Swiss-Prot record, chain B:
Protein's UniProt name: Hexon protein
Lineage: Viruses, Varidnaviria, Bamfordvirae, Preplasmiviricota, Tectiliviricetes
Residue ranges crossing the lipid bilayer per the database entry: none
Superkingdom field: Viruses
Gene from which the chain derives: L3
Additional remark text: All late proteins expressed from the major late promoter are produced by alternative splicing and alternative polyadenylation of the same gene giving rise to non-overlapping ORFs. A leader sequence is present in the N-terminus of all these mRNAs and is recognized by the viral shutoff protein to provide expression although conventional translation via ribosome scanning from the cap has been shut off in the host cell.
Quaternary structure, from the entry: Homotrimer. Interacts with the capsid vertex protein; this interaction binds the peripentonal hexons to the neighboring penton base. Interacts with the hexon-linking protein; this interaction tethers the hexons surrounding the penton to those situated in the central plate of the facet. Interacts with the hexon-interlacing protein; this interaction lashes the hexons together. Interacts with host dyneins DYNC1LI1 and DYNC1I2; this interaction might be involved in intracellular microtubule-dependent transport of incoming viral capsid.
Family: Belongs to the adenoviridae hexon protein family.
Whole sequence portion shown: 508 to 557 of 911
Location relative to the cell: Virion; Host nucleus
Disulfide bond entries: none
Induction line: Expressed in the late phase of the viral replicative cycle.
Physiological role: Major capsid protein that self-associates to form 240 hexon trimers, each in the shape of a hexagon, building most of the pseudo T=25 capsid. Assembled into trimeric units with the help of the chaperone shutoff protein. Transported by pre-protein VI to the nucleus where it associates with other structural proteins to form an empty capsid. Might be involved, through its interaction with host dyneins, in the intracellular microtubule-dependent transport of incoming viral capsid to the nucleus.
From Swiss-Prot, chain H:
Annotated protein name in UniProt: Hexon protein
Further facts: All late proteins expressed from the major late promoter are produced by alternative splicing and alternative polyadenylation of the same gene giving rise to non-overlapping ORFs. A leader sequence is present in the N-terminus of all these mRNAs and is recognized by the viral shutoff protein to provide expression although conventional translation via ribosome scanning from the cap has been shut off in the host cell.
Function, in words: Major capsid protein that self-associates to form 240 hexon trimers, each in the shape of a hexagon, building most of the pseudo T=25 capsid. Assembled into trimeric units with the help of the chaperone shutoff protein. Transported by pre-protein VI to the nucleus where it associates with other structural proteins to form an empty capsid. Might be involved, through its interaction with host dyneins, in the intracellular microtubule-dependent transport of incoming viral capsid to the nucleus.
Gene behind this protein: L3
Induction note: Expressed in the late phase of the viral replicative cycle.
Species this protein is from: Bovine adenovirus B serotype 3
Full protein: residues contained: 103 to 152 of 911
Record's subcellular location: Virion; Host nucleus
Length: 51, 50, 345, 298, 111, 101, 111, 50, 50, 111, 51
């Protein structure tokens, strides 16, 4: 659907490869640069929201 | 401690080192002018840890 | 968990009945009447204060910008500031009965206490009457403005092992725990809570392969391979070139990098002379109770640019105190006073 | 102001502006019916004889007056002037040290590997292996993943179609991409793929796929030694027919910066045969860093 | 472009009411499309706008899932200019494809 | 002084999910699944001839052979079985055939 | 476009720090290039930015005398729109050249 | 407050799937597929188990 | 061989072949992926309900 | 584009002098034409500007009836961007027309 | 049946391979966290390698 706020749209989209994988920023704790201005609390493992 | 200054063989460190001497670290220094010369170790085994 | 519009997703709530359950302490009617008579007295009114006692002032930010807000009148009994960036997509217009143009579920930073964008502030400038900067006594290491982050750090102005400056670190330490002057010790557990500074301050450090190296190649996102034969995977086992090695005698030179991340923090700038909190009324604020003059305030925010249209959420802090008066038998007279930012018409 | 006293912002403590009877009642009935939280206390900060208001600094930086840097110790001398009235405690005055430190080849900030963590440890990296006699041409193990029709000049791969409806042939440097090809399990198992392409290491050091890192030499992801050409070899599983497999054999400086070798074969017969069975292992993470509380630094 | 110094003015307070954003497509109470406040569908009142899923205006999509979040109105605006740029680029691509087909046909006819 | 204490994830099972979004793909020890051989071929003048004494190639066209696992689901079901099913009440369990108890 | 009065607001005083102009490449003490303050490169702190002539950031040009003073960083911005304009004009020129050579080829085939 | 809420088709209380988790993602579920000619009888990818 | 109205209520199609050539060969290579979990629930401390 | 609140600043009072609007052709007392208060013809002060119907400047139409009410000045502005859009669209239409002419010529040659 | 010879029926249960994930992970952890840190005299150097 053209509506970017719809669950179907934001579900049926797959991330590109190379940005995040088991080699980037190896050996350090460093949040991804392109994932800093995105709600860490809008996560499926938000324990409060799950409860 | 190793991730604070990053990964990689080479790195640039910006550290703050405190005063640990018992008679100095808590001293309330009165007005005046004092020389505070200290010597920092450069031994690699003692500075770093693996 | 996803900020999807739940109205267009077919989500509705139907309320069948609403009741309230009062709880009455069973106390002997003699002492109950005694307490009632005592609390009906004019000298025994009950006074309450809002915890986040402030006058919230939302200010819109067009994408990739630095902003200039300005109030223009008295600041008697001022307490301090608190600044934080929010996304406009996630901030509702709660001044209306219904907000059709919200179209966003999930955490609401403005009215939930979820401030993930507090790290995108570069520096803050505060000026009174367009002539004097507020903390101007050469108080800070950079006298002219507060400098939250420095992106070059020509001098040694950086604190701990992160992107943030020493003066801003000291300001935050004094504003939240009163720790700067007597050393920097880790604050006790009971004082370090969720809506604090060091409970969310996470320094990070990554080091890049120094793209200025001779023989270095900046690969695109499509020619960047590792485990090529292991999406349902496909390819053949081949040597890789992703993540040029940083350690080992083959290193391709080095270039470090540092940045910090605070996720539930309000940047506090207390209106005190020494930045401590020695009481509700600060050292200043009651230095202006003389009503000698009213000063216009000019504030400037330089901040990291992000593409999403966002909003600044300054909370000019104040004294929001309400005193309830119950003269006799079921009539309540409640009087409010927000001293620095009044509402009496 | 009388207004602040009325609102208890700055007026008086609750226990001394409430009625004495109410104070006694609250003190008595404190275990069960708490009343204290219903009343406000001013908590006013001092307004005089607390701060200088005379334009002095908070943070001061003292550059070293003199310094010497022996190859064993670094001694710095600072002279600090404590104003004329101000007083500090030496709980402040931390030493800010800036510099560059190398952590050496022994540094290893992670367990496992970082290049072929998903690869089998003993698997070969499409290595071309020599025959036992060492006189015969070396045979190949590489597996052709990309599929395309083989035709045109010198029998390249059919990568795509350009603006005209004409074939496009693979650029020898990088085009036979080790990441592009058959997607979906049906092709090659139910449906029959006629022709396929791949990429081969020639004249290699016989390293297992686990490390198998090679620095780029062009801005396209390709790897090959400088001033070294790439040539193609054709293969088929049948006889007297159109070849099925095309391989672009190239020689590259394949290094293993991450892993080391466990059960390594002798170098005399490492490259020919049964050196393919070498299995690499992670490199024992080291985690070199500064000491706790910067201990030992002074 | 030169010396942009973006947001050089002083920013007024964000209005507390709803309808400040110029071109967001909003949502109805039961789930629908509500035209942005910039649009001409708000110059009057329509009685059944609320308590109704499907749209009651000429502009917009008939279903709430078929509407882009940011409707583009007023061709003078940057969004309209960008849309016309995209249309011109698509037309140029169509011309390139037609030329490609004509070249292939000419080559086949020649040989 | 070690109190009996259940695990708060087995007393109250919480099927939060398994987040098995990606495959697992166990791969053979050999990279290419050594099988039937192939002959090196070169173009002499107009047709294809086998290259002299080159018949030990091990090229297998197509994607690698592999088998899926669903690691997350396997681990979750192992946990749930071993911690709840084996402790289910005895009336809900059955003795296996040809086994005497 | 029509009722435009440039600077209709009240201008705020220029900040006294460095990094106000939106898209302007600068230089360090040893030459080099520093990215514009709105680039996605000052979110962090590259310590070696000073005291080097080469560019330690992936973005931007590698040599100081090859980086244009004003570089575009936002596709939505007027700079990005003008860049798209130039690209599409070049595309029209390329299509015109292709059509011209095709016309000469057709004429040669006819004669 | 008492009532009934439908929280929309977007609801999904769990990660992964709940029906055929162990099944390979690309595996067909014992179905019938057609031929290229489409006039031929449809073959099966089946598996006789019992 | 029976006819069933099988559907995917838990998963969505990633790498779906064109609908025209779906029932035939190489329409079996479609691999499903689970939907992204949503976890719709009430707000913290019932914020916004008032 | 996204999240744009139109007029988000505090507006300054409209100036009360004559020339305030940008790029708007005016007229003199004798029904002539005067350039907008942005052209380079207002840096100086021509003597007989307000005494004749014909314009004594260079930029602008020679007659008031042949001059558009709003002239496009500053090519970097939105008006210049729209004019460049129109030029590109006209060029694309001309390219399509000549391609169609070539196609019809080829079709005629086929027979 | 006429021109129907593309069936892919394999009788019996699906051919799989058992793994023993739990013991495998436990052994991996135990090895990588104890055996590598065993003192030098217990460890041995592999054949055809130089240190």
């Amino acid at each position: 659907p053209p509506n970017t706020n719809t669950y179907e749209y934001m579900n049926g989209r797959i991330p590109v490869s190379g940005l995040i994988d088991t080699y980037v920023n190896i050996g350090t704790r460093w949040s991804p640069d392109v994932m800093d201005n995105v709600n860490p609390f809008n996560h499926h493992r938000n324990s409060g929201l799950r409860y | 401690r190793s991730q604070l200054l990053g990964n990689g063989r080479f790195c640039d460190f910006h550290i703050q080192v405190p005063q640990k001497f018992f008679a100095i670290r808590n001293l309330l220094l009165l007005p005046g002018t004092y020389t505070y010369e200290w010597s920092f170790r450069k031994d690699v085994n003692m500075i770093l840890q693996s | 968990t996803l900020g999807n519009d739940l109205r267009v997703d077919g989500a509705t709530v139907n309320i069948t009945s609403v009741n309230l359950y009062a709880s009455f302490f069973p106390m002997s009617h003699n002492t109950a009447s005694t307490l009632e008579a005592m609390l009906r007295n004019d000298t025994n009114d009950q006074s309450f204060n809002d915890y986040l006692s402030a006058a919230n002032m939302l200010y819109p930010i067009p994408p990739n910008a630095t902003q200039l807000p300005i109030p223009s009148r008295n600041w008697a009994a001022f307490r301090g500031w608190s600044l934080t960036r929010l996304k406009q997509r996630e901030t509702p217009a709660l001044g209306s009965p219904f907000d059709p143009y919200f179209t966003y579920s999930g955490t609401i930073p403005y009215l939930d206490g979820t401030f993930y964008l507090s790290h995108t502030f570069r520096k803050v400038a505060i000026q009174f009457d367009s002539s004097v900067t507020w903390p101007g006594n050469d108080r800070l290491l950079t006298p002219n403005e507060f400098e939250i982050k420095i992106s070059v750090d020509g001098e040694g102005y950086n604190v701990a092992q992160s992107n943030m400056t020493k003066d801003w670190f000291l300001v935050q330490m004094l504003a939240n725990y009163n720790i700067g002057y007597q050393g920097y010790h880790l604050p006790p557990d009971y004082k370090d809570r969720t809506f604090s500074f060091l409970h969310n301050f996470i320094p990070m450090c990554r080091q890049v392969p120094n793209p200025a190296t001779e023989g270095y190649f900046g690969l695109g996102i499509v020619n960047h391979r590792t485990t090529p034969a292991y999406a349902p995977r496909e390819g053949h086992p081949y040597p890789q070139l992703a993540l040029p090695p940083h350690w080992d005698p083959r290193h391709a030179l080095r270039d470090p990098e540092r940045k910090f991340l605070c996720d539930r923090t309000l940047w506090r700038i207390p209106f005190s002379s020494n930045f401590m909190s020695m009481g509700s009324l600060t050292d200043l604020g009651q230095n202006l109770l003389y009503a000698n003059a009213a000063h216009a305030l000019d504030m400037t925010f330089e901040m990291d640019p992000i593409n999403e249209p966002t909003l600044l959420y300054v909370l000019f802090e104040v004294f929001d105190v309400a005193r309830v008066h119950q003269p006799h038998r079921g009539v309540i007279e409640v009087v409010y006073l927000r001293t620095p930012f009044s509402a009496g018409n | 102001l009388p207004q602040w006293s009325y609102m208890h912002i700055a007026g008086q403590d609750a226990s001394e502006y409430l009625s004495p009877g109410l104070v006694q009642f609250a003190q008595a009935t404190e275990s069960y019916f708490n009343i204290g939280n219903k009343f406000r206390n001013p908590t006013v900060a001092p307004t005089h004889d607390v701060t200088t208001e005379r334009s002095q600094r908070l943070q001061l930086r003292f550059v070293p007056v003199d310094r010497e840097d022996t190859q064993y110790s670094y001694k710095t001398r600072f002279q600090l002037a404590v104003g004329d009235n101000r007083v500090l405690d030496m709980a402040s005055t931390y030493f800010d040290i800036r510099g560059t430190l190398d952590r050496g080849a022994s540094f290893k900030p992670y367990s496992g590997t970082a290049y072929n963590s998903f690869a089998p440890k003993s698997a070969p990296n499409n290595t071309q292996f020599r025959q036992a006699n060492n006189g015969h041409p070396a045979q190949t193990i590489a597996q052709a993943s990309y599929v395309a029709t083989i035709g045109g000049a010198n029998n390249d791969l059919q990568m795509g179609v350009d603006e005209r409806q004409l074939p496009v042939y693979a650029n020898t440097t990088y085009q036979p991409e080790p990441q592009l090809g058959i997607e979906g399990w049906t092709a090659g198992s139910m449906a029959v793929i006629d022709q396929a392409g791949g990429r081969v290491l020639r004249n290699p050091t016989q390293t297992p796929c686990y490390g198998s890192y090679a620095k780029p030499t062009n801005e396209h992801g390709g790897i090959t030694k400088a001033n070294t050409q790439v040539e193609k070899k054709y293969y088929r599983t049948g006889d007297n027919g159109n070849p099925e497999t095309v391989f672009y054999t190239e020689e590259a400086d394949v290094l293993t910066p991450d892993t080391h070798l466990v059960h390594a074969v002798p170098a005399a017969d490492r490259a020919k045969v049964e050196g393919l069975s070498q299995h690499a292992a992670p490199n024992r993470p080291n985690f070199i860093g500064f000491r706790d509380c910067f201990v030992g630094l002074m | 472009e030169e010396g942009r110094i973006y947001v050089p003015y002083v920013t007024a307070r964000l209005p507390k009411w709803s309808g400040s954003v110029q071109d967001k497509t909003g949502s109805n109470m039961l789930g629908g499309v509500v035209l942005p406040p910039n649009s001409q569908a708000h110059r009057t009142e329509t009685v059944g706008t609320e308590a109704t899923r499907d749209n009651l205006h000429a502009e917009g999509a008939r279903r709430p899932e078929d509407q882009t979040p940011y409707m583009i109105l007023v061709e003078d605006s940057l969004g309209g200019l960008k849309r016309r740029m995209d249309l011109l680029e698509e037309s140029n691509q169509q011309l390139l494809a037609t030329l490609n087909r004509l070249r292939t046909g000419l080559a086949a006819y020649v040989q | 002084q070690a109190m009996d204490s259940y695990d708060p994830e087995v007393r109250v099972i919480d099927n939060v999910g398994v987040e098995d979004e990606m495959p697992n793909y166990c791969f053979p020890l050999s990279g290419v699944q050594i099988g039937n051989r192939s002959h090196e071929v070169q173009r002499n003048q107009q047709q294809w001839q086998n290259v002299a004494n080159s018949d030990n190639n091990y090229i297998g066209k197509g994607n690698l052979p592999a088998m899926e696992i669903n690691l997350a689901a396997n681990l979750w079901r192992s946990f749930l079985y071993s911690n709840v099913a084996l402790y289910l009440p005895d009336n809900l369990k059955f003795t296996p055939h040809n086994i005497q108890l």
